[model samples]
Target chain A: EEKEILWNEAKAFIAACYQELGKAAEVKDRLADIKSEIDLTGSYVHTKEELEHGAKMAWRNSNRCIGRLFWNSLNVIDRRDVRTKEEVRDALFHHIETATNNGKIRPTITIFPPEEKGEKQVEIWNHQLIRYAGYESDGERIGDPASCSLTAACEELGWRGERTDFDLLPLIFRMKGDEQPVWYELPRSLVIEVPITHPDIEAFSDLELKWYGVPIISDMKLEVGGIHYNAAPFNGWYMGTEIGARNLADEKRYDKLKKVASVIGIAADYNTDLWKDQALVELNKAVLHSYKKQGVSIVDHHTAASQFKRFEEQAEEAGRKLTGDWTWLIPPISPAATHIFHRSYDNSIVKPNYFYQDKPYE
Target chain B: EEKEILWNEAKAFIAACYQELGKAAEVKDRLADIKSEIDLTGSYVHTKEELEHGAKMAWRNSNRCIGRLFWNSLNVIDRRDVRTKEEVRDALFHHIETATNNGKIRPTITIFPPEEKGEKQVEIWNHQLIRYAGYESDGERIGDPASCSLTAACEELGWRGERTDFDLLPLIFRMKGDEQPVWYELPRSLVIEVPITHPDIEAFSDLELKWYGVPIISDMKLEVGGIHYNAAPFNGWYMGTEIGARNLADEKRYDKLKKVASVIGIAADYNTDLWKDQALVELNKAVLHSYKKQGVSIVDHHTAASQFKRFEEQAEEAGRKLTGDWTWLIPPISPAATHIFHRSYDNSIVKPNYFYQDKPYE
Candidate 1:
C-alpha cells in the first residue's frame, strides 16, 4: 500500500532548503506542490532542492552514525531520471569513482528511483559496492571469511573474480521488476586499497593484508518523507579501526592480528589477551599512518570521538536531542578512551534516514 | 519518618536460606519469630543462620562485584556484638589476620553495631583499613596522592606514616557520643604486603612498587532488613588488574607505569599507549606470578570473567534476577578479551545490600 503523503515532512525540509539556497518566493511553490500531492493522485516528486536537503537530514538522522559533521557536504547525485539495469550499473560506477575522490575520499551518496508497488524496482545485492573476496576452497579461507556465502552466490551467477585476498565483489543489481540481477565488475582504478603495513616491521607490509579505502554501504533503504529509495548506496571515508581493528583484525573476518602479533614477536601463550591488545593498537596506528601517507581521509578513533563530541554539542546548541546506538557509535578499540563511553544514550531512530527495510544482501 | 521493617525482603531471604539448609524445626522457630515481628513492636533480631545467609545475598546483590563465584563461601564474622570503637578496630585487625588467612585469602566481613535511634553511634572514617599515604608536595605527590588527606588526618592525630609509597593508613573510628574519634595503628604482622616484581625484568622489583593483599573497604554501610551497620568493613582477594593495572597503574593513583616503562627500556617518548599497554600486561603478569609464588590467592581478569559467567548462570538457575554494573565488571585492560563485554546487565540495587552511606570518614 502507498504510505500516507509526507506533506508535513516535506514542508519543513523545503523551508530549510529555501532558506539556504532559494529566494523567499521560491519556498511558496514547493509548499503548493507538496499540498497538491496530498489532494491529487500524482506521484509525489522531490525537487532537486528537496532531494539535497532530504539526503542531509537522512545522514543527520542515521542513529548509529558518528560521522554527521560532514552531512551537509555529502555529494547527493539525483538518479531518479535513470531507468533499466544498465543505467543503474552506470550510476553505481560513477558513484564509486566520485566518492573515492581518487584518495581524498569524500562522503557521497547516489539516489536512484524509489521502488513502487512491485513494479519500479532497484536493489543492489552487494553488501558494499567494493569489498574483498573470501575463498573457501580447501580447509581454509584464503581471504575474508565474512563474505564466503555472498561470494559463492556471485560466483554461481557466472561471475569470476581473481579470488585473491583483495578481489572486489561484483555489484549485482536489478531494476524494472527484473529480480534476476545483472552483475557488473568494478573498474580497477576506482578501488584504492591501502596495503596494510607497520612502521617498525617491514615484514608486516609483506602479509598481503589490504582494505578498500571507501566503505560504500549499498544495502540500507534510504527513506525520506515516506519515499523509499531502495537503491541508495552511500559512503564516507573509513575510520582506521573499521579496517585495522575489525575488518582485518576480527577472527571471523580476515583475522590478521595473530600474524601481526607473530611478526611483532609477542610470545605470551595466554588465550585471553596474549599480545592481541598490543597488536591491535599497533595495527590501528599503522592503518591511520598508511592512510595519512596515502592522502586518504581516515579518522582515528580518538579523533572521531572528539569530532563526535562537537557533533553532540552542535545538536545541543540547536536544542536537538541526540539519540544514539552506543554499541555502534563506540570505537572497536580503546572504547573507554572515547567521551562517548562513561555516559548514556537514547537510540530512538529519526526520520529522513536510511531504514532497514529488509536484509536484501549479505 | 521511620522506614518499615522490610518484612517481605527478610521473609524471601529467610525462606531461601532455610530451603538450602533444610532444617525444619530450626527454620520453623526462626520463621515464626520473623512472623511475630510483623505484629509486635519489639526490635527484630537476626539469628546466626540469617546473618550468614544475609551476607551471602548482600555480596550476590553487589552489582559491581566480579568475584561472585565465591559468594557462598564468604567468612561472615559476627562483630554485630561489638559496640565500642576499640572493639570495632580489634574486630578489623582480626578480620585482616583471618581473611589474609596466611597467604590463602578469604573473603570476609566484620559487621559492627548498627545505629539505633536512641543509642550512641559507631562509624569508621578511613575508606579502607589498609591504604598507602599520598602526601602533597610542591606540585608533586611525594607519596600516594590517594591517601594524602587521610595521611594528613593521621599526622594531625599524632601519628606519622613515614611518607613512603607503602604507608598504611591508621584505623580511625568513633563510638557512642564521643565526637572525638580514636586512632589505632594496624599491627605490622596483620598487614601482609607483597613487593611487586616482574619475572623477565628483575629491575622491575627494584622499583620497589608494592601493595597490600587485602582491600578492606571500611566505608560502605551494610544494611540488613531495617538495621544499618555503620561500620562493617569487608574485603575479598584482589583481581590482579585491580592492583597492577589500576591501583599501581592508574595515572591518578600511584602511577608507577612511567618508572616501569623506563626500567624496561621501552623508549616511547611520553605516555603513548603502546609502551603503556605492554607495561600494564607485563606488570599484571608479575602481580599474578608474585601472588602465586607466595601462595596468595589472586585471580587474573580472564579467570574472573569465566567465574562471573558461572555466577550469572547460578542466578539464572535460582530464578533470582541478576544485576550488574557493566563498566565496573569489565576489566580495565583489554576489556574485549572477556565475555562480559558483549552483554548488558540490570544494575538495580536490591537489599540485604551494602549501601553507600554518608561520607562518615574523610
Candidate 2:
C-alpha cells in the first residue's frame, strides 16, 4: 500500500530533478531501477550525486527563504551511513565548523539518516545549532526569551547554563532506539561571535550586544523525492535585519530598542516621536558594521532583496516557476522601501523542499 | 437568479448587523420585509438607521484598513437622493469639504445611489477625491507620479492642472446614463494642506513638501447587504507612514529619500549606511510634527498599530472573528516592533464589507 505512494512521489521528484539538472536522457533508466527497488522494499536509496543535486533543488524550492539567489552554491555533506548517537553529534559539530569557515560562512547542509518504516532515525531538539540560553527567575527574564522553552527542556535533561544574557546553549538531539536525548556543549573555539558596535555612537559598544557569526537552523527536515533526511541542518550567512531588527529589537527577544534609543539620546515614545524607528535603523547599522569589522559575512536587507530580484529574473529566463512567501520575503524594517513588498508571491509548496518537523521535546 | 443571491447576502448581513447592534428582536421582521421587497423589485432599500450602522459595519469589516478602531465612530452622510451628474459632482465636493473638517479631519463617508439592474448609479474615476496632479515634460517628471495616469485621464476629459509638485487634481465622475465623464475643479477654500517641516532640522522646510489634510478614497464600492453604493467616498485622518514612508519617499512617487538624507547631512548608501532607513524615520517624524503644528489630525504608525490591537481585543470580546490582510496591516517602517507583524490573521471576506469595483475610466 505504501509502495504506491512512495513510487508516485519518487517519480514526480526524479522527473523534476532530471529535467532541471539537464540529466533528462538518463531519467528513464534511473526511474525503472528506482521503481523496482521501491516495489520490493517500499523505498529507494539515492546516489551521492543525486543527493547533492537534490539538496540544492530543495533549497531552490524553499518558499520562505529570501536567500535562494545562492541556492545553487549550497555545499551538501553526505553522512547517511551514520547510525549511532555519537556519530550524529560529531557530524553536526563538523557541519558547524566547516560551514563557519572562519567567519566566511558557507551556505551548507549536512544530511543524516533518512526515515525508515515511517520513523525518523535522528531528531534535533534545538531550533538552531547556536543559540543563547534563556531563563526566568523571580518574575525577571534574562537572555534570549525566545529560547526559554528549549532552554527549560535542556535543563530537564540535566544540562546547565551560566544564565548570562549571551550564554551559549548546548546542542541536544535524539537518536533512533535511544531512551533519552543527548546534549553536548559546543566547543568555545568553534562558536564565532561578533560584538555589536556603532560606527558613530561610542556608547553603543557599552550596550555589549553580541551575536554568533552563522545561524545554523537545525530542526527542519529535508525531503528529497520519497526519502526524508530526518536531520538536515542548513544555513546561509546572516541578513543584518534578522539580528538587529528581530533578535535584538523584538520585545519578546532582547527588547533592546528602548535601551538603544536612550543611548542614541532620543526619548522613547511609541506614538509620534519615532524613537523606536530611529533606534532600529541604528541597531541594524551597528550589526552590519560590527560583522564587517570582524571579517564576518552578512548581507543588508536592500542587497538581499536586490539579489533575490536577480534570482527572480534568472528563474524567469530559465523558464522555471518562481514561488515564495511574500510575508517572509519582505524585510522586517523599511519593508515598503524594498521592491519585494510591492509584489505578490505564490506560496504553493513544491518538492523537493524543506519542511518543519515536530520538536522531539514537545 | 439575482434575487436569490441578493436575499442570501441580505439575510446574512441583517442577522449580523441587528444582533451586534442589540436590535436582534427587529431582525426577523426586517428580514421578512426585505425578502418581500426583493421578491417584487429584485432589491430592497436600507432604512436611515440601517444604512448608518451598515456603513460602520462595512468599515469594521475592511481587511486592509489599519485605522478600524474608530470604525464605529464613522460619520455617515446620506446623499442617496441625488441622481443627476451635477448633483453627484456637488455631493462629492461636499464630502471632501466636510471630511477635511478644516484640518481636524473627520472619519466620514458620503453614500450616493446604489446600483440598479447590475449598473452603477454613479462612479468616481479618481482614486481619491483630493490628490495632487502628475505631469511629464522634457523627460522630467513632476508632482505625484502615482497620480500620473489619473491626471492624464483628467486632461483627456478637458481638465488641466498647472505643472507643480502639489497642484490639486480635478474630480472626475460619471453619473447614471451620462454620455461622457464630467470633471470639476475644486474651490481652493475647501482644500486644506499641511506643509512638511522637521521639528529639529530647519532645512527640512526649504524643500516645500506639502500633503492633503485628509484622504478621501472615492473609488471603492461600499457593499452592504448585497447592495453596492458605487459612489461612497470615505475619509480617515492620515497615518504618518502613509505619507512619509510611501507617498513621498517611494522611488516611484516623489523620490525624496536622497534629498532628505542630504539635508540631514548623511551620505546615501542602500546597504550598511542605512541612510534611507534613517531618513524615512525622520520624514515620518516630520509628518507627525507638521500635522500637529498645523492642528491637523494624524496618527503615527505605532499609535495606529496599538489602536488596531485594541480593536482586535474588542472584536474578540464581541465574539467577532477578526480578519485582515497581513501585508496591508503591517506598517511600512519598523513593522516587527508592532504586534500585528507577530501574529497571523484570517483574510476571509465578511458580509456588509467594502470591495473594489471596476474603474469607470478603464
Candidate 3:
C-alpha cells in the first residue's frame, strides 16, 4: 500500500514531466506554423516559379562544385616547377592549332571493298617479273631480248647448263651467238644463273658470281629498250634449240625459258640501288633541262634535289609513286611525268622530254 | 585533230596542279607538327592559352578559308539575337562548373559477380492480433469475457451482428443492469484497421493512412485496471463479466471507452473528432504523448488501424479473405504490442546527428 502511494507520487511527477515536455512541444508548434505558412505561400502564390528557382539553385550549386574542382586541378599543375609558364603557354597554343587543323583536314584513307566478295584485298599491288633472251621456233619466246640481252653478259665467262639444271641457258645463248666450243669452258653441272637485272646485280655484284632472287619492285612500271612493253620480247629467235644439249636438259631449258618469258614483259632494270641513285641524278638534270628549255634560270641543284627528295619521300611514305620505272634512262620532266609516260607509251621510241640533256649516243 | 595539242597542254596544266597543291599540304604538315607537340605536352598546358595563341593564329593564316566560314557564322549569330557577352560568360561559367562536377563524380555503377557458392535467403517477421467476441463453445467460454459481455447486450436489442461491420464500433456493448438472457451478436463482417508510427510522421502518415496500412506502436507493455499489468489481465475479475456498463443503445459508447483508455494509458483519443482536431493543432503534442506515456498517439492509432486494413484488403484482393467477412483489431495490451511497438521505438531511437542538413533527404 505504501508502494502504491509512492507510485501515485511518481505518476504525478511524471505528469509534471509531461508539462516540461509540453514546453518543447510548444516550440515545435510555433516552428510548424512558420513552416506551414512558408509552404502555403510557396504553393499558392508561385509554386511553379519557386520550383524552377529551386532547381536552378541546385544546378548552380552543383556546377560551382564542379568548376572549383576543375580550376583547382589546373592550378595545381600550373604551379608545379616541372615546366616554365612560357613552355606551357606554347604547348597550349600548339594544341589548339593542331585540333583546329585536324578538324579542317579530316584526312582519311578510303578503302574500297575487294572486287570478289569475302576476299580481303590489300591496298598495295604485288607483282613479279622474270627475264629471258633469244628466239623460239614455234613463235614462242625463249627469252625477252631486252632483259636477256643484259643477262647474257653476266653469264659470258663460262657455260654450265648441264650442271646447274639450268641447261636452257646455253641453248638460248647459242641461239643468240654462235654455237662455238671455242675458249670458253662449259662446266659439266648446270649453273642456274640469274641475269643482270638491277635487283640481281645489287645482291650479287660484289659476291662470287651466283644467281640472286628477283627484287621486289614497289610502285614502278617496266619498260623495254625505248618502249614500255607488257609481254617479253625475243620470242621469235630462241624457242627449241640444242647447243649440244641432252633431251632431259632440253626439257629443263624449255621450262626455264617459259618462266623467263612470263615476267620479261614487265621487267625493268631500274629497281636496284644503282639505278635508283642514277635515276636521282638524272632527275635533277631533267629538271634543269626543262627549266633551260622553258627559258627559266636553273634553280640550285642541291636545293632542288632537297625539295624533290622531300616531296618524293612524303609521296612514297603515303604509298604514292613519284616516278615510275619504265623511263629509267631519262628522268621524267615533272613530278608525275613517270606516271604519264607509263600510261601513254609502249617499250619503243623513248620520249624526248624524259631523256637527259645529251643524246643517247654518238 | 588539231585540238589534240591544246588538249595535251590542258592535261599538262592539270598535272601541274600538283605543284600548287603543296601549299595546302605544307599547312597540313605544320598542323601535324603542332599536334605532335601538343600530344607530347598533354593537359599540362592551359586550354585558354591554346585558344588565344595557336587557334587565333590558325584562324588568321593558312587555315583562313575554314576560319572565315566559322567567323562568318559566328558574326551572323553575334549580330542577331545571341546572348550578350556577360550572359555568355555566365553561361560558360555554369557549364564549366557542371562539367567539372560531373568529372568529380564520374564513377560508373559496377556490378560485381556474387561470391562463389553463396546462398541467398530472405526473412520477415509479422505480429498480428485478431479479436473474436461472443463465442461460447461446449459450455466453455471461447472469447474475451469483456467483449462477450458487451456483445450480449447487442444481441438482446435484436442486433444481427451488423454493428461489427462498422469500422469505428467496438466488438462489445453493454446496458446497465442487464443479465438474464445475456445474449450476444457476432459482427456480420470482419473489420480490419491499422495505426501509424514513424519519425517523419508528416511525410509518411497520410500516405500510409491512404493505403490503410498500420503504423508500428512505439511504446508498448502490459497494463491492468487503469494501471500497469503483467502477463494476462483477463485472468482476473475482468474475465467472463461486465466490470462497467452504460446504455447498450448509445451510439457514443465506443467513443467513451476510447477516451477512458487514452487517459489511463496516456494515449490520445484518436477515434474522437475533437482529439483529431487537437492533434492537427499541435502535432508535436500528439507525438510527445507517445514519447512520454509509452503508448500510442494518433499516428500509431492511424498506423495500426491502417495496416490491419491493408492486410485485410490484400487478403481480399488475393481472394483469400472475403471482403467484410472478418474483422481485425489491436488489444490495449498484448504480446504483439511489444513486438510491433519495439520495432518503431528502435527505429526512432537511432540518431543520425552527423547527416548534412543541406544535402538531399535520403
Candidate 4:
C-alpha cells in the first residue's frame, strides 16, 4: 500500500503537469510509460520538462513546506552528471549562493543522480547543507539542539568544529558508489547570515543569536516522474515564523523561548497561554526586521499568507487544485488572520513531488 | 447552477449521513424522488430522521466550525412550525437558556420555517441575537463593527438603545409574510456575559472589555434535503479567537489592541512585531481566563485544535472522511501553537448544511 501510494504520487504529478504543458498524445504516452516502467523496473527516468515540473510538484506536495505558494517560481538545476563528492559539494555551495541571491532569496533545487537500475544511490548526510553545529560538553549543550545529532555524527568521522554556540557545520555526502563519505567546509564567502536583533533590543545583539539566510534541505528525496533523486538539495527563502517559531522558539529545538520570555518579564508561573506567545512574536519581529535591514529577502507570515492566497486563486484559474499540507501551509504565527487559515485544502499528493527518504544518520 | 448545486448539496449530505447512521435504503427512496419533488414544490422535504441527522451533518460539513469535534452531540431543535415573531423570540431565548446550561454551552440549533410553496418564510433580522450594538457617536466608535448595520436597522424601527460601548442587541424577526418586524428584548437573565480580566495584568480589567458568550448566527439558511430553513439558528461554543481576534481585535471591530498595548506597557513603536501581537496574545489569555472564571463554556484555540484532532482520528476510525473550512478552524491568537494550524482538511460540503442566506440588515 505504501509503495503503491508513493509510486502513484510520482506518476500522478508528472502526468498532470505534462497534460497541462505538453501535447495530449505525448502526455498519455509518457504517463503509460511511467506506469509500465515503475511496475517492471521499480523506477522511471524523467524527461527534462518532467524533471522541472516534477521538482516543483515535489515542493507543492511537501507536507512540511509553507513556502510552496511560489512553488512554480523555482529554479531547477540538473546536476546528474556530477559524481564526485567534490562536485556535489561545489553544486551545494552554488545552490546556496544563487538561492541566497544577495538577500533576494530564490527558491531553487539542484538534482543529483537518482536511484537508478544497476547504479548506487548518491546521498547527503546533512539534513540541510547549511546548518549550525551543536556541541555537547560536560553538563551543557551549545548551539542549535536540532543539529546535535548531525554534529555528533561528523565528529565520529574525525571532523572538528570550534564547539561554539553558532559554528557553521560542514557538508557531508557519499558519492561514486563509495560507502565512505567526504566532508567539505562551506566557503565562508558563500555564507550570508543575519544577526538577530530588534530596534529596541541592543542586548539582543549581544547574544550573537544569528542564522544563515537560506535553508537548503539536502537530505530529502526529490521524487519526480517516478525518478527518486536521492541527492537533490533544495532551498527557499526563510519565512520569519520558521526561525522565530520553530527553530529558535520551540522548547526542544533551540529552546530559546524561556529565556526570551524571562527577558520580556513574563510572570513566573504560566497558564495554558504562556509568556512564550509574547516572546515568539517579539523574536519573529526581530528576525523579519533584521533580514530586511540586512537586505535579505524574508517574509512575515501575514505577507506570505496574502501571497499564497493570490497564488491559490491563480492556480484555480489555471485548472490546478492547489494541494496543500495545512499544518505546513499555516505559518507558526498569527495564522488565523492570514488568508490561508480561513479555508481548508485537499491534502491529496500530486505529481512531480518530493518524498521523505530514510534518515541517513540513523 | 445555483439551485441545482444547492439541491445536490442537500441530498448529498442527507444520503451520506443517513447511510452512516444505518438508513441507506431510506436515504435512496428520499433521494430518488428529490429531483421531481424539488422541481414541483421549489424545495424538498426531509424526514424527521433526516432532519435529526442532517443538522449534525451540516455541523460536520461546516468548514469554519471547530465545534465539529462534537458533531453528533449537537441538539437539533426542529422549529419548522414557528410562525409568529413572539413565539420565535421565546424559542430563541429557550435555545439560549437551554444551550447556555448556566456555564457549559451546549452545541445547539433551532430550525424555523423553510421557504416552501404557500408557506410563511420566517426570517430573523438580527445576525446574532446576542451581538453588542455599535453606535458611532463621539470621537471614538462605541461597540462592535460587525453590529453597526443591525444597530442602524433597529434604530430605523424607532427603538432607542443605551448607546454604551456594550449594549446587548434586541432580537428582531418577521414571520408569515409580515413586512413589519417584531422587536423583543433579550432577557438579561438569559444572556451570559464574561467579564474580561487577566491574572497578571491588573490594568487589563480597567478597560471593562466584555462580550456575549454564544454566537448564534441567525442570518444563515439551513438546507436539509433541498428544504431551505430560512430562519434556522445554530451556534457552536466560541473558540476564543472568534471573540478575541475578530470581535475585539479586528481593526474594523473594537480595535482594542492599541489601548490594551498601552496598558500592558509594550513599547510605542514597532516593525514586523507590533505591540498588537503581544497585546493580542495577552488579551486572548484574558478571554480564556475570564470565561473559565465565569464558568462559561469556551475553548481556547489550542484545546479546540487538540479536540478536533481527536475528532479527526475518530472519523477516520469510523471509515468516514472529515470535511472542514480551514480558515475558520484556526484560531486568531497564536494559531501556530495549535494542532489545527499544522494540518490540512477536506473542506468539501458534506450536505444537510447550515449556509449563509442574504445579509438581512445589509
Winner by lDDT:
2
Could you give candidate 1's per-residue lDDT for residues A76-127 as a string of tens digits? Answer: 8999988777888888889989888878887889998886653447877788
Highest-scoring model, TM-score: 2
User: Which regions of candidate 4 are displaced past 4 Å?
Assistant: A1-127, A132-169, A173-181, A185-214, A217-239, A249-271, A282-330, A336-362, B1-50, B118-120, B135-141, B160-162, B272-274
Candidate 3 per-residue lDDT, tens place, A47-85, comes to 222222222222122210111111111110111121232
Clashes per model (N, Cα, C within 3 A): 3, 0, 55, 15
Q: Which ten residues in a row are the worst by lDDT in model 4 chain B? A: B1-10
Q: lDDT (0-100) at residue B304 of candidate 1? A: 87
Candidate 4 matches the true fold with a TM-score of 0.69
Cα lDDT tens digits, model 4, A1-362, are 12555466655665577676765567667777777877886766677887787787677666556566787888999987886667877888888889988888888999988877525467789988889998777889888877888898888888999988788999887765676788888888899999888777666665567888888888877766556787888888888888988888765567777677666556536445646577778788888888989999888776667777787788788876778766567766766556665567788876556777776674
Rank ordering of all candidates by TM-score, starting from the highest: 2, 1, 4, 3
Q: Tell me which residue pairs clash in candidate 2.
A: none
> What is the Å distance of residue A336 in model 4 from its true position?
4.4
What lDDT would each prediction earn against the true structure? 0.77, 0.90, 0.23, 0.77
Runs off by more than 4 Å, candidate 2: A1-4, B1-4
TM-score of each: 0.85, 0.97, 0.12, 0.69
Task: List the pairs of residues colliding in candidate 1.
Answer: A58-A352, B125-B361, B134-B144
lDDT by residue (tens digit), candidate 3, B133-205: 3434467543333345434544555644433322221222111223221222222232222222223233324
Candidate 3 i-RMS? 53.2
- Candidate 1 TM-score over all chains jointly: 0.85
